[PDB]
Design an enzyme around this catalytic site. Structure first.
Site, PDB file in Angstrom:
ATOM      1  N   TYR A 149      12.432   3.221  -4.832  1.00 23.30           N
ATOM      2  CA  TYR A 149      12.946   2.710  -5.490  1.00 23.30           C
ATOM      3  C   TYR A 149      12.391   2.684  -7.411  1.00 23.30           C
ATOM      4  O   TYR A 149      13.223   2.523  -7.617  1.00 23.30           O
ATOM      5  CB  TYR A 149      12.337   0.804  -5.164  1.00 23.30           C
ATOM      6  N   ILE A 204      10.200  -4.216 -16.059  1.00 21.81           N
ATOM      7  CA  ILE A 204      10.530  -3.502 -14.514  1.00 21.81           C
ATOM      8  C   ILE A 204      10.100  -3.947 -13.823  1.00 21.81           C
ATOM      9  O   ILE A 204       9.663  -5.583 -14.009  1.00 21.81           O
ATOM     10  CB  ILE A 204       9.288  -1.849 -14.821  1.00 21.81           C
ATOM     11  N   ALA A 205      10.987  -4.640 -12.794  1.00 20.09           N
ATOM     12  CA  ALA A 205      11.309  -5.261 -11.713  1.00 20.09           C
ATOM     13  C   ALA A 205       9.721  -5.312 -10.880  1.00 20.09           C
ATOM     14  O   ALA A 205       9.777  -4.167 -10.532  1.00 20.09           O
ATOM     15  CB  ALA A 205      12.296  -5.842 -10.548  1.00 20.09           C
ATOM     16  N   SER A 256      18.677   2.406 -24.226  1.00 21.04           N
ATOM     17  CA  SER A 256      18.750   2.200 -22.995  1.00 21.04           C
ATOM     18  C   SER A 256      19.199   2.869 -21.969  1.00 21.04           C
ATOM     19  O   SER A 256      20.798   2.444 -22.358  1.00 21.04           O
ATOM     20  CB  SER A 256      17.368   1.102 -22.491  1.00 21.04           C
ATOM     21  N   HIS A 285      18.319   2.499 -18.631  1.00 25.28           N
ATOM     22  CA  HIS A 285      17.310   1.554 -17.306  1.00 25.28           C
ATOM     23  C   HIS A 285      16.636   2.787 -16.812  1.00 25.28           C
ATOM     24  O   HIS A 285      16.640   2.971 -15.271  1.00 25.28           O
ATOM     25  CB  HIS A 285      18.226   0.461 -16.847  1.00 25.28           C
ATOM     26  N   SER A 323      14.027   5.449 -22.264  1.00 23.74           N
ATOM     27  CA  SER A 323      14.704   5.547 -20.861  1.00 23.74           C
ATOM     28  C   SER A 323      14.320   7.324 -20.712  1.00 23.74           C
ATOM     29  O   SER A 323      14.609   8.736 -21.691  1.00 23.74           O
ATOM     30  CB  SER A 323      16.390   6.001 -20.736  1.00 23.74           C
ATOM     31  N   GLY A 324      13.032   7.704 -20.239  1.00 21.95           N
ATOM     32  CA  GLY A 324      12.990   9.401 -19.905  1.00 21.95           C
ATOM     33  C   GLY A 324      11.278   9.222 -21.597  1.00 21.95           C
ATOM     34  O   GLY A 324      11.402  11.107 -21.136  1.00 21.95           O
ATOM     35  N   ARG A 344       7.658  10.417 -21.972  1.00 17.82           N
ATOM     36  CA  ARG A 344       7.089  10.803 -20.955  1.00 17.82           C
ATOM     37  C   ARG A 344       5.563  11.682 -21.923  1.00 17.82           C
ATOM     38  O   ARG A 344       4.567  11.895 -21.401  1.00 17.82           O
ATOM     39  CB  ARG A 344       7.185  12.167 -20.192  1.00 17.82           C
ATOM     40  N   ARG A 391       8.371   4.131 -15.976  1.00 19.67           N
ATOM     41  CA  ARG A 391       7.813   4.496 -14.759  1.00 19.67           C
ATOM     42  C   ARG A 391       6.374   4.829 -15.279  1.00 19.67           C
ATOM     43  O   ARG A 391       5.303   4.832 -14.137  1.00 19.67           O
ATOM     44  CB  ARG A 391       8.568   5.649 -14.494  1.00 19.67           C
TER      45      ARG A 391
HETATM   46  C1  LIG Z   1      11.248   0.541 -10.491  1.00 15.94           C
HETATM   47  C2  LIG Z   1      12.398   0.131 -12.161  1.00 15.94           C
HETATM   48  C3  LIG Z   1      12.202  -1.039 -11.740  1.00 15.94           C
HETATM   49  C4  LIG Z   1      13.186  -2.006 -13.501  1.00 15.94           C
HETATM   50  N1  LIG Z   1      13.338  -2.681 -13.740  1.00 15.94           N
HETATM   51  C5  LIG Z   1      13.999  -3.491 -14.256  1.00 15.94           C
HETATM   52  C6  LIG Z   1      14.477  -4.375 -14.391  1.00 15.94           C
HETATM   53  O1  LIG Z   1      14.713  -5.572 -14.478  1.00 15.94           O
HETATM   54  N2  LIG Z   1      15.290  -5.023 -15.815  1.00 15.94           N
HETATM   55  C7  LIG Z   1      15.378  -4.409 -17.168  1.00 15.94           C
HETATM   56  O2  LIG Z   1      15.572  -5.165 -17.960  1.00 15.94           O
HETATM   57  N3  LIG Z   1      15.286  -3.093 -17.113  1.00 15.94           N
HETATM   58  C8  LIG Z   1      14.436  -2.262 -15.537  1.00 15.94           C
HETATM   59  N4  LIG Z   1      14.151  -1.344 -15.589  1.00 15.94           N
HETATM   60  C9  LIG Z   1      14.663  -0.746 -16.836  1.00 15.94           C
HETATM   61  C10 LIG Z   1      13.117  -0.130 -17.744  1.00 15.94           C
HETATM   62  O3  LIG Z   1      13.182  -1.324 -18.250  1.00 15.94           O
HETATM   63  C11 LIG Z   1      13.025   1.174 -18.982  1.00 15.94           C
HETATM   64  O4  LIG Z   1      14.288   0.745 -18.953  1.00 15.94           O
HETATM   65  C12 LIG Z   1      12.697   1.821 -18.035  1.00 15.94           C
HETATM   66  O5  LIG Z   1      11.848   2.515 -17.037  1.00 15.94           O
HETATM   67  C13 LIG Z   1      12.856   3.713 -18.451  1.00 15.94           C
HETATM   68  O6  LIG Z   1      12.935   4.615 -18.750  1.00 15.94           O
HETATM   69  P1  LIG Z   1      11.165   5.780 -18.091  1.00 15.94           P
HETATM   70  O7  LIG Z   1      10.676   4.729 -17.270  1.00 15.94           O
HETATM   71  O8  LIG Z   1      12.265   6.497 -17.146  1.00 15.94           O
HETATM   72  O9  LIG Z   1      10.825   6.414 -18.524  1.00 15.94           O
HETATM   73  C14 LIG Z   1      14.163  -0.734 -14.399  1.00 15.94           C
HETATM   74  C15 LIG Z   1      13.342   0.794 -13.689  1.00 15.94           C
HETATM   75  C16 LIG Z   1      12.522   0.996 -13.408  1.00 15.94           C
HETATM   76  C17 LIG Z   1      11.374   2.052 -12.938  1.00 15.94           C
END
Ligand SMILES: Cc1cc2nc3c(=O)[nH]c(=O)nc-3n(C[C@H](O)[C@H](O)[C@H](O)COP(=O)(O)O)c2cc1C
Ligand SMILES: Cc1cc2nc3c(=O)[nH]c(=O)nc-3n(C[C@H](O)[C@H](O)[C@H](O)COP(=O)(O)O)c2cc1C
Ligand SMILES: Cc1cc2nc3c(=O)[nH]c(=O)nc-3n(C[C@H](O)[C@H](O)[C@H](O)COP(=O)(O)O)c2cc1C
Lengths: 352, 352, 329
Positions: free
Chosen positions: C34, C88-89, C218, C220, C252-253, C255, C275
């Site tokens: 997930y 992140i949820a 983003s 996401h 978004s990405g 690292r 992440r």
């Molecule tokens: C497990 C998971 C759950 C996420 N849940 C949400 C959410 O609840 N609301 C939201 O706006 N973005 C959500 N996102 C997107 C993140 O806010 C963010 O844009 C994304 O993690 C960034 O990319 P990266 O983590 O690959 O660098 C989620 C992303 C992941 C990985």
């Protein structure tokens, strides 16, 4: 105001010379009004020079028949792929005003666009039109009742489309410096140029499209994102125009904007193109670039000045005949063939 | 020297005509001084033609309200996104000299830039300014005491920023061929144009920024690496300029240099743009390209020549009104909207 | 019976990519997929990562004497480095201390916490973890106007200092938002509203015109639209169109410290981390999440030294090398 009144056919060899000829018979103020444009006219010049940016190739024929200029738009067959643009106050050019223009257009066999700012009283226009197809051009009123009024007027006048002009005709600003029966019919007793919004929004387009009972063209589009927004708001056509360079100054030549719009519209709705069409070659280039038809403006009015309805008719006749020759040379038998032409990209521009 | 002295409002239809009109009332030598530029003026022509390289699109509105030209820079709200450029010797144009200019600018509601080479005695300027915001323009002196002196003068005069001009005003070389109270106040008895460095360095910028107690704009920037160096040396603003083509000849039009600078500055400090602004469309294009405000120069001085403070005011009024119209046509409700405009890239240049 | 990790410890973070693999060892398979997964065959998630190789950093001479300082500010809040926590949820999929753990790491480090609409911890639990630290609330557009008004009231009363309006539904909520939605939220929130999920410049212009106080670029983490560009490739066009009107958050990405620098050089005010912080959380609770924030700060410091940058503003001024060859060079 002493507008010309003579009715006669004219030998139209080119449309550029009609401007200078017209300047001899039209009162200076009215002539300036018709001919002039924003700023120092650099964007009007751009409208004209843009045609040299994409050049026609002569090509071998692939069909035996004589060329046929006829086409259809909104289900109506017309004699050639050009319509009359909505232009205010034809009385500045000729005493027969919009009735004369309508006669020329109807007799020729195309579509007449009626400006909300017509100097003629529709009944006058109707007698020139004699049954011919007509579209009604409106501005977006600030007062919604006034939009209801004009949409009712248009339906009553047998209009088969509405032309929603996106830009308010305060005139546009130049470096240099009649009534309006159709609108006065509804504005009387209200005491309301300033009655209309200076610029329309997608919300306005949706309101007009929802209530007109007729296809709505949005006129004045020069950017593809506006075409997409307009279509999403309920437009039934996109009319690519800068109103003959009469509004925004230091903007591109209208023809340069056409392909990006045509590519974004992607067949969703018909495209009318105008602003600078002076030759048969321009009609061909517009069609090759994505327009279904073009609108003609100043050259027809100069024709009107010079010969009333017969003078205007001579101009439409010139375009039809010149287009036929361009079709022969491009190996095109019909209007669809013209839509398939390959154009040469000229990166050098006007001076080559 | 008999400079014009009449005070009157003028009907400004365009700023280009103000040059020729001014040539009728300004003594030939003074007029040449104001109007002329380096070499054969090819770079001045470039300043003007550069505006045709990026063209404005008309766009649908997205907001209901009337356009608002106001903006803020360094925390001060101003009536429109343009300020007065620092220009020497306004007495060459009008007997009320810098006091007249200051009055027009203050009454209009923007920022006055005071040239170190002003012909007026600050107390004179102050009476025109009547409390209005002012910035002080300096050259880098070879003698550090003289920099201390002028920085003290600026703080005493209530300046809210320093404009450090990067290039020495020997005038610049042309093919063709009053006192200075503010500087004479400090140079008296010293016997010291040649008093200043011909060109500043990052080290100079750091010295001025460290000691001014005020934000320092570095004026004359045309290359992005200089903007970065200047910011690193402690500049609080970048003023993109070629001083109206009065310095380096066979250089680009100023507007062509703006985007690369704006991209390198990347929001770090405010950008003032000048050199060739003549129309509302130019103000819009500068903002769309990364400037926070533009500075106006020659047109205001020609206005001054023609009508003292009221003539100069009429020019600022023209720009404000013309900009409002450009905002309507571009679907812009405010100055921030203008910063978001998409421009059409014209690869053909002036002749199209 | 979801058996999430529960150990709290600092970790030696040498690179964020290895955190995914390490995390896969301690997070239940379903929860891990997930978190780590993305749309389609993950080609757009790979695009997010490979996009960083399209614009390359130059080493450059220094022009100031002082050591690098990563501090910045956004919306008048001073933060330790130019990155914030993305919304992140369900952080409880990664660790038993869930969003409370993440909040503690973020507040201890000294940046801004974004709280997802689908948080598994209560606000009181999160509040304890934040201990007064700044927080932004992420919402979806509800179909019910009253629900929106209630969420916006809850957020401001919970001390939120911005609202993040996420343009896309993953999952009562709208699937996609419109300019009118943006306007309705901006009009009633009493707080600056970021619009998150922007990848096209015209949408940024429309959002700002509708009343957004920030643009959050983003996709996401490639979790929504498949066969779309890498997020970083979209950033310059958006930044050029925004033209300083409102702050830009980029994600978004991200690292590496080099990615933070490249985002700033290309127009972002800050970036958001996603992440990698969650993998840190899985591995060490709040201390593990903290170690990841600490890695990014220290790695950015090194990148600043090499690029001749003394501060975050200098990073915004970097020239980047355009690599037309892309990943395989
Ligand atoms: C497990 C998971 C759950 C996420 N849940 C949400 C959410 O609840 N609301 C939201 O706006 N973005 C959500 N996102 C997107 C993140 O806010 C963010 O844009 C994304 O993690 C960034 O990319 P990266 O983590 O690959 O660098 C989620 C992303 C992941 C990985
Ligand atoms: C004298 C004059 C009046 C015009 N009045 C209107 C008007 O009432 N409504 C409108 O939509 N366009 C108006 N237009 C613009 C035309 O519809 C058309 O876009 C333009 O004439 C085409 O440019 P061209 O004539 O140079 O080829 C007017 C143009 C001119 C020449
Ligand atoms: C007559 C004249 C005198 C000027 N004197 C100065 C000066 O004292 N210091 C300075 O920084 N710039 C000076 N400038 C340049 C202006 O600040 C400004 O950059 C220029 O006028 C803008 O170009 P434009 O007026 O053609 O639009 C002068 C320009 C002219 C026209």
């Amino acid at each position: 105001y002493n507008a010309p009144s003579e009715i006669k056919y004219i030998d139209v060899v080119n449309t550029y010379d009609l401007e200078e000829e017209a300047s001899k018979v039209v009162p200076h103020g009215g002539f300036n009004y018709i001919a002039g444009a924003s700023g120092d006219e650099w964007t009007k010049r751009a409208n004209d020079r843009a045609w040299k940016h994409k050049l026609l190739y002569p090509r071998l024929a692939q069909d035996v028949e004589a060329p046929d200029t006829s086409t259809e738009i909104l289900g109506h067959k017309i004699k050639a792929p050009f319509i009359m643009a909505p232009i205010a106050a034809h009385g500045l050019a000729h005493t027969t005003k919009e009735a004369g223009t309508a006669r020329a257009v109807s007799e020729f066999g195309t579509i007449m666009s009626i400006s909300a700012y017509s100097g003629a009283t529709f009944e006058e226009i109707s007698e020139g039109l004699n049954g011919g197809p007509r579209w009604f051009q409106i501005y977006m009123a600030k007062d919604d009742q006034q939009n209801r009024d004009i949409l009712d007027e248009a339906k009553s006048d047998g209009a088969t489309a509405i032309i929603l002009t996106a830009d308010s005709t305060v005139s546009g600003n130049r470096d240099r410096d009649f009534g309006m029966p159709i609108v006065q019919r509804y504005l009387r007793g209200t005491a309301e140029y300033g009655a209309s919004k200076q610029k329309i929004s997608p919300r306005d387009i949706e309101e007009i499209a929802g209530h007109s009972g007729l296809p709505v063209f949005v006129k004045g589009i020069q950017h593809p994102e506006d075409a997409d927004m307009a279509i999403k708001r309920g437009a039934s056509g996109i009319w690519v125009s800068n109103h003959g360079a009469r509004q925004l100054y230091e903007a591109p030549g209208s023809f340069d904007t056409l392909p990006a719009i045509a590519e974004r519209v992607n067949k969703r709705v018909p495209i009318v193109f105008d602003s600078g069409v002076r030759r048969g070659e321009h009609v061909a280039k517009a069609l090759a670039s994505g327009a279904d038809v073009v609108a003609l403006g100043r050259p027809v009015l100069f024709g009107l000045a010079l010969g009333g309805w017969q003078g205007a008719y001579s101009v439409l006749d010139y375009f039809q005949k010149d287009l036929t020759r361009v079709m022969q040379l491009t190996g095109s038998q019909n209007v669809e063939d013209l839509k398939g032409l390959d154009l040469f990209d000229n990166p050098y521009g006007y001076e080559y």
